Each structure stands twice: as C-alpha cells, then as structure tokens.
Symmetry: C2
Subunit: 636 residues, 2 copies
Amino acid sequence: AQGTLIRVTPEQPTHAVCVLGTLTQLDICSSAPEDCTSFSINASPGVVVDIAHSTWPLDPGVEVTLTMKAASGSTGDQKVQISYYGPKTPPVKALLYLTAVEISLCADITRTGKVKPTKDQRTWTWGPCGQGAILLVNCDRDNLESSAMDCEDDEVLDSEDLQDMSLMTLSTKTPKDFFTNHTLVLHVARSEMDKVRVFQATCSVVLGPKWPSHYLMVPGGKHNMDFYVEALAFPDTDFPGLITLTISLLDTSNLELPEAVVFQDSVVFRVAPWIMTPNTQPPQEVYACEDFLKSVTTLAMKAKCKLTICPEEENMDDQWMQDEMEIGYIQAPHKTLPVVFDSPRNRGLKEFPIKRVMGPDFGYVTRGPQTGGISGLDSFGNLEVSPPVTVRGKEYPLGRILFGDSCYPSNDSRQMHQALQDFLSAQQVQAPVKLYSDWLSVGHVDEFLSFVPAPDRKGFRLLLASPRSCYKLFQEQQNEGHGEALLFEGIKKKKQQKIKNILSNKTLREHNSFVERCIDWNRELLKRELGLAESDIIDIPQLFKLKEFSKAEAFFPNMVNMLVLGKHLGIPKPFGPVINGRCCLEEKVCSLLEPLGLQCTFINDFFTYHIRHGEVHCGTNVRRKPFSFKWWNMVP
Amino acid sequence: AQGTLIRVTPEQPTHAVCVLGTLTQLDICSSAPEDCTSFSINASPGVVVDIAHSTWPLDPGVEVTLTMKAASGSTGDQKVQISYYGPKTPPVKALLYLTAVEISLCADITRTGKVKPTKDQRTWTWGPCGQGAILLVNCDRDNLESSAMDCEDDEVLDSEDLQDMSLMTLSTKTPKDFFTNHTLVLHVARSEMDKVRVFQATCSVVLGPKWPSHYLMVPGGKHNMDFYVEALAFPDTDFPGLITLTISLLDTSNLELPEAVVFQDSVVFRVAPWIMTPNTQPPQEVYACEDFLKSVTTLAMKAKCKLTICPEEENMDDQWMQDEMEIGYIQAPHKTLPVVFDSPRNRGLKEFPIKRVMGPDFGYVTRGPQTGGISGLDSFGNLEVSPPVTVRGKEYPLGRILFGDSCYPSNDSRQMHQALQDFLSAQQVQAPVKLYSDWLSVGHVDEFLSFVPAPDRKGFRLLLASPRSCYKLFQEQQNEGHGEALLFEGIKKKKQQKIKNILSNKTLREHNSFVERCIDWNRELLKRELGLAESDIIDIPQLFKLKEFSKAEAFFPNMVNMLVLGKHLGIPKPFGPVINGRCCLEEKVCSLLEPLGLQCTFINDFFTYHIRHGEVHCGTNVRRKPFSFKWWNMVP
Ligand SMILES: [Ca+2]
Ligand SMILES: [Ca+2]
Ligand SMILES: [Ca+2]
Ligand SMILES: [Ca+2]
Ligand SMILES: [Ca+2]
Ligand SMILES: [Ca+2]
Ligand SMILES: [Ca+2]
Ligand SMILES: [Ca+2]
Ligand SMILES: [Ca+2]
Ligand SMILES: [Ca+2]
C-alpha cells in the first residue's frame, strides 16, 4: 500500500501513474489558489477517492486519497478534477490525468507450494502464521557428468534443475504505449548478490554474483514473466540467510533528466537450513566400506534399506564411514532433498562424499580448513542430534544438535572446529548443545550415548553407557557362583579374565568411577537441555579403561555405539562371560531393549574395529527420512 | 540450581561436595540392596532433604533431593544416612558425607550499578525487566602520553582506567583444607577470548586474546576476589556482542586421574553499542576548522557550548569537519563516555580524530578499508539520526539511523561502504534506514533534510528542502510587483538574476521538478519508517540545479543544511531578493521557524563553502548529550 504524493495545480494539468494495490495521496493545499475558501472533487468512475477529516473546507489537515479499480487501457484514461471555490469567486479547476497499471511480483510466501501475489510485506516471519518464501542452495549435480555443484555455473544445463529452483513471476497489465516511457528493473543488494542467482524463463541469467541489477524487456498490455531463483550459500555467521529481490518501476519519459522511480516492490526469500536426522526417524539407505558386511546386510534387509559399499582402492585403508560425513537434508514446499555434510578431517574417505554420494538429487556441503589444523572432535562420530523434544515449554520439533567438547579450554583440550560450530548454530532449527566428550580418547559423543525408538512416553529412550550397571551385573553374577566366568573367551589371541579378578581390581574401579563422573555430568546436561526425566533414560552396562593421558577407552566392545535401523539393532558383540550358554551382557542388554519392541543383534567388529578403537556404528552410516514437520513452521 | 547426581551404596560411605544455591540429587535405588522393600532418610540438621512422590517405599520413580543451609566449617561436617529395610530383615545403612561450600560469581546483572550474586541465569535479556551485565570497549586513551587505545596493551597503566571496566567478584566460603583437593578455573570460549580482557585486582591479567583459561589461587574459608573486565570489540557482523565468563570447580583429589568438574557457573556480558545523538538533544561542545568563526562563535556562546578549532597546518586544506567524523557515545550503568566514529574517507582531517579529539574519556572507533576503494556517501555528511520516535506501536527511544543511498544498484550508482552499514546494523539500538541521496552531486542526506526541536507534538520538526515552496515564494513576490528583484545581490563576483527571469526559466523548472520527485520519494520513505504525519514536516524553500551527470546542487546556499545548537540556528545565509530591506528568503524561513521558539541566524559561507559545494552544517560538528533512556531497556 506504499504510495506516492501527487501535487496538483490550477495553473496546469498533471499526469501521474498509479499502481494497483497502492494507496495514492493528493496535495490540494500547497498549490491552492488564493481567495478560495473551499474545494470539491470529481473523478471518472474508475477512480475511487476517499477523503477524510458533498463539499469540503480547505485545510492542510484534511486528507485526500486515491485508489483505482482497474488497469488503464489507455494513457490518462482516468481523470480527477479539483474545483477550488469561494464566496465571491467562480470555481477554478485543476486537472489530473491518471494511468493505472498492474505491477505485481509474486513468489510462494504462504509456503504452500503455489505462487501468490504480494499481507505485511517486506518481512520474513516464522511459524504456521508467518510469511515469506523459501530458497534452496544448489548443492547437487544433476548434470550427468560434472564434478561440480550446480551453482558454480551461472547457466542452467538441465530441465530437472528448475525443480530445485523457486519460481517467481512478474504480472503486468498496462496500456500498450506504456513501456515507451517507463522501464522495469529487477535488483538485489550488492551485499546479497553473491548469495543468489536468478534466471529468466522463456533460460538466461539476470541477477547473480556479478550483476546486482537488470532491465526487464516487457510489452505493453497483459504480460507474465517467469523467473527461477537458486541460492548459492547456506546461512552462516556472515549470512543470516535472507535474500530480498526488488522490482522498480522507472520513469524515463524525460531525456534530459535521469530515471525517476515511481514504484518499488519486493519479496523476501529465506535460504533453507541444513537439517540432521535422529535415529528415531525411519531409515532409507545404508552405508559401509566379510564377517561384518553380511551381518549388517541381513540387518539392513530386515529394516528394508538399500546398501552401498566403498572398495579398498578408494577407501585407501580408511574403514570409518561415520566420521567423514553426515547425511542431512534441505527442505522447501516445492522440493525436499538430501544433502551431505562433508567433514574437514579428510583421511581415507575424503573423495567419497564429493564423488559417490553426491549426484542427482543429492546435495553437498562442507566447512573447515581442509588444509590441516584439525582435531578428532572434528569427525562426525562427534556430531549427533536428539529426537524431537520439548524443553520447559519450548518446542524442538526437529530435535537438538549434540556435539562433544571439553569442560574448559586448555592447552591439552580439544574442540570441534569453530567453523563447524558456527555453521550448526546458523541453521537455528535445531539449537546445538555442547556435551563433555573430551575425556574419551577418541572423544566422540556416540561413544557414551545413543537414542532409540520407543512405543510409549516421548517415543524414544536415551541410552547411556553405565560402568556401574556392568559392575553390578558382574557382582550379581559372582554372587550366584559364576565368579569364575571368563571374559574375552572365544578369542584366538587375547588375555581372558574372570569376573572375580576384574571385580577385585581397584585400578579399574577408580577408572570407571571417574568415567562414571564424566558420563554423569553429561547425563545432567542432557536432562536439562533435552528436558528428560529418568524414565526416559536407560543405562547400558559398559566398562572403560583410561590409558593414554588418562583418556578413556572401551574395556570391551562398546555396545551403546550401535547401528539403529528402525527397531532392528546393530549392537556390537561383547564377548562376555558365558552363562547357560548365553553371554550375560547380551542377555542384560536384550532384557533392557526388547521390552521396547526392539530386536537386538550382535555383530563381531572385534579384530576389525574394537581393537582399532572403534565399533559398528562407527564403520557405518545411514540416510534417514526427513521430518514431516516443516522447519519454517518452527519459531526458534 | 544446576546440580549433581550422588549415587550412594550400603557397601561403603560416599564423600561429595555441595555448592550452596545448587539443587543436589540422590540415587537410592541403583545401589539398593536386595531383600529390602523400603527405605528411610536421616540427616544432620544443616542438610534439608525434600523427597517427593515418616517412611517410604523403594521405587526408581520416587525422587530425593538435598539442599544445604550453610557452608561447612569442616570437610564432611554434614552427613546423610539412608536406612534400607524390609519385612524380615534388619536395617542396612548407607553413609554419605557432605562438604557444603559457597561459590558465587557476581556482576551487575540488574544493570543498577551494583554487583549482585548470580534469576534465570546464563542468558542476556533486553528491557526494563530483563537481565545481564553491560561491558564497554576501551576506545580511549587515559594514558597521558600514548598514541593507542587502552585495549591493545594487555596491562592496566592507570587508576582511572578501572572506571571504564566492569567489576566482577568471586565470593567463596569453604573449609580451610578445601583447596588442597579442589581448584577453581576461570575461562572464556576460545571464540570470545580475542574480544575480552580480564584483570585480577589485589593488576594482573587472567583472561585475554591469548589465554582462554586461568587457575585461581584461593585460600580456604571466607574469601572475596575482584576482577575487572573490558571489551576489545564492538558488536559487528561476526560478533553479536555477547561475552560469557565461566567459573569451574575442579576436583583434583586424585593424582592418578584427571580433574573432575563438580560445578560451573557463568555471567553473560553484553558489549555496549555505539550510539548517535540527534539534533534534538542539547549540545555540549562545538567543532570547526574569519567572517565565519565569529558568527558560529557568538552562536555557540548563546547556546552555552565550548569550542575547538583545527589550524590549517593540520587540516592541510580540508575544511569539512562534518564529513570525517561523528561523535556518538557508549553507555553502561557505571560509566558513560563519548566515542568518535572516524570515517574511512581520509582526506585532510584524518589525523584529527585519532589525535585531538581522542583522549581521556573520549573513545575512538573506525570501519572501512582506509586504503582506498571509497565513495562520497562514505563521509558522515551522509550519516544522521532521527529523534526518538514511535512507528506503528514500535518504540525507537534512541532514534533511527538515516543514511543515503541509490534506489537500485548500477555501474554509476554510489553507496556507503558495506562495512559501515553492517557496523550500524550490528548496534541494533537505532535501526538504520536507507534514503535516496544518490541524486545529489555530493549525495548527503543533510543536503535535503534536517531535524529541529519543537515545543509541541512529538517535540521536533522534520525540515525538508522544498523547491516548490521557493517557486511559490518568488511567484507571490512577483505578483506584488517585486519581480524585478535581484538574486545574488551584494556579491562582488556573481551573475545576478531577477525573480521574473528564473520564474520564466523552464530548464530550471524541469530540474526542480525532478529534484522535487526525489525529495518526495524520501518524504514518503521517512513518513513510513519514522511514523510521521504532515504536521511533523516543514518545507524550507530551496532551489537546485542538475549539473554534472544531471547531479543536483544547491542553486543558492542550502539552508536546510544548518547548524542546530539547542534553539539557536546556524542557517546559511541565502543572498535573496531584498524587499523592504529584508531578504525574502530569510523572512520566509523565520516565519516558519520562530513560531517554534527557534532563533534564526544567517552565516555567510558563500565564497568559502557554498561555491565549494558545501555549507555551514558541513564545515562544522557538534558533540551532544547522551539520551537519558538506557539502551538496554529497549527491546529491539
Ligand atoms: Ca544451475
Ligand atoms: Ca540442481
Ligand atoms: Ca572431506
Ligand atoms: Ca535436483
Ligand atoms: Ca553422526
Ligand atoms: Ca587497559
Ligand atoms: Ca580507559
Ligand atoms: Ca579517518
Ligand atoms: Ca576513561
Ligand atoms: Ca553527521
């Protein structure tokens, strides 16, 4: 409804343009003739004049406003006439000729999947009742053979490409001669131009990193013009994630003067954030790079998932697929696609994300130096997310990002690279949470925690490693006369130990006391930030040993670090004291999990992983299904 | 109230620490003995146990919480005892020894000027009902002879220095032997450490750009410890402006293990923004660099202001003091001081801000390349601020920043450097607004606008240049027979012109029509963003001419560009057609302004400024008085 001031004079007629949807304002008094007390307005049928605070007295305070019903077929085909009169003097008329035109920029600001006419404009608001359009980055390659993301081009090399792009239309209705005297320009702020590209559909580029503005070629009369917009960047520290595109109507009718802006209108796009998927979400495809693969294969099957493997020659000795990448997604009403976050750690798998996984309808993103200057907390073993959760009346429908850290900064402390942290914060939809993982030798949060699907309560359980739980398990076991039982039996090479020997070992006990302290610190942490009760947590019996720098490791294969496919569990096989032909550990675990409807399967990673200081969940990766909840409907 | 989990066992006693202010939690069930149905709690007088959902049944769902009345005088001088009993079995007791200590980090989070004990913690909230501490950057030099700001040092070289700094105290109450087994550390995130420095008062540095953490040396018993914090950076694109300082309590009682964090607490500081002062605020000192100086001197006097001049040798030919700098301020409950924003334009005056103005209790800041790559919109002729204003129910108590720009980006368009814009946005307290000034040759907003104090309404008027107002003035003048009157009479060299000659000049008329369009675009702009009505605006008759690139200039000395000292006006003298021994222009102006209580004085800048394409307001600068309204009480 942003209008213009039109100043009219008795001396001469005035010619003005009026955009439909706009509220036009009239100045009578400035130019009003002397000796006239009062005034009157008369106008062609298509012009509706509302005049506030019949005849009227002449006062600078009275207000006259013009609105128009429809676009003009001809220049000046509507007119207003102002009669200035007074007691002894005959009426003196001022003439005004109006050309009404329809200029509307439309995008999908109702987030319904359908383009709508421009409502409180010029702002992007969160929630179900909010407004403003969504934009996706082009992180994939739909170009059958190309090694780069779609957005380094400046050109559209595919039909499917348009599907990721957001549609913006310009609707004009004008007299025919109109654009002889007027010219439309479409622009972005120089500050936002490197973050967006726009294409004209007949596809030719209009706006982009080198081009803040462009002149539209438009015919008089009724015309419609399609544009396709793509974002070149994710929200980040330097980029809040909003892009504004503006249409200006310029008056060129004077050659000796410069262009004169009559009218401006805009749309605001918000770049869609990168989102992680919790284990609570249903799986889609599975990732790993002979004993092992068949177990995880039957598993993946029972869970109805595809599978992909990376042969050595590509891997180049690197068996951890959990650490190099994280499969998230980006989402817009029109389009939803998976995007791979690629970790800066760069060891054996670095090419894998940029090559095999990235492709048609699979996006890619990365952060961090990649040159060096990196930590162990930089691998995605250390990046996780909770299931949807409500904390103290604040709703986190997409979950909450969890990543590991130290308690305070020191020389010997480790942390995730600042760039990653910042990246995660900039998405805003799942507020990241810092946990204390630096006590662990490797230092990953998945080492002490996991989440599982639950039929009741909040629909999930938090699993935490519990040395206490294990000590107690073994104690009860001894009490029943099994204290002679051998741990690590069934192993070609290993040093087997009896329950009574470990239970009587005081060093081990100090170690697991300390570990217990650490895991507990995190337990209270998670309770506060996830709003969890004790009924939401389950302790997995697990043992640890502090070794190098008193850094903690799994005493036996770490079970809480496990592959969760739906309700089918990819638990690492502890080789526990066998009792009644049954490992007491497996039995305890199942007695815990099965009541939830989960099935527990135990895979042997032992000489392949556990002795390499890793486990099942680590040598593996999963793509899951995007939340039904629309991120824009959140209000962070 | 963030606590710890204490797990107790019948097998052996447990020793734990409890911080006062913290809510401690007890786990009975995990370690509970078999054959016991129920349990009972008994505790020394100083320990209050609240146990929810007398005796009690043993269930994992029942919840037991410990709070302590006062700090322990001795290690373990409070104790809890849990009795596990059942029907056929005698009570079995578990012992727990508590040492209670007082650890509190205090800063001024009520923003009252007094340090308070740590309330919803760990967050900084806006408004009168919000919370969290304020921090000032050290932008000045209190070091009598030093060329640098106080914050490049790392050391405290003055007593007065502490006055800018914010006080944070640590209050401890502990048993004496306590710190034999425990150690306090104070830290900042590595991400925030370059933005803060902290000093220990006995002054020694503790935290800073190279040092994220430090070990506190604290005696047992009752002790108090002063720290003094200073910010090294203003809020900016990369720095939202929050600094968090944390205190951790580490348990070192085990040599073979690492430190174990018992307790953490924090304060959040918010770095104070840089704020501009509108002309509506009462003046303090005046700035300029022979006809002129005496006029502005009598003026400054009548307005009760100090004065300072810059001699040529320093100026080096540069007479514009308005363009190189802007005097704002930073504000904290404990301290409020002026800070100079120094423009990147860097011509003749560049040294002046970093030397003469910067000093004791005068801060300094700068943005932009300073190497080159600069515009004319980068001078502070182009930076202004409105008076306090309310727009559509949104309160802007500190005003709204206004700066000039183009309508859309082109090759030939100019803009203020992005770094400046970003800087201004990052302060948030006065939301900057973009106006269209690029039509002007110089392109400054002060060229077409000014603000003045008003006794009524909103307490100010917006003054806009009005070519229409001037044309009408001359027309009425001609009608009364003065059309022969000479403009520019009284000038040694100049081409004088009669009212009838300019009124009959059609080129001039087109030019001022276009200019009128531009100023009007801005008029509606300002009406929307400042929530102004027409009764708030006053049009100053002013004429223009488009010359180079059809860029606009003042036809005669530009009056709206004027020195406002309280109600005493520093208007540039137009040399107008003299009528009744009185310039019609001056007379019109006064007839407009005097009713408001303002006095109008007309200074001759003509051969010194106006012919250099500048005026009075431009060759001059003013320091005004900071708003009474506290910026933190705003809610942007
Ligand atoms: Ca493309
Ligand atoms: Ca694509
Ligand atoms: Ca990589
Ligand atoms: Ca695609
Ligand atoms: Ca992960
Ligand atoms: Ca200092
Ligand atoms: Ca100082
Ligand atoms: Ca400078
Ligand atoms: Ca000072
Ligand atoms: Ca200024």
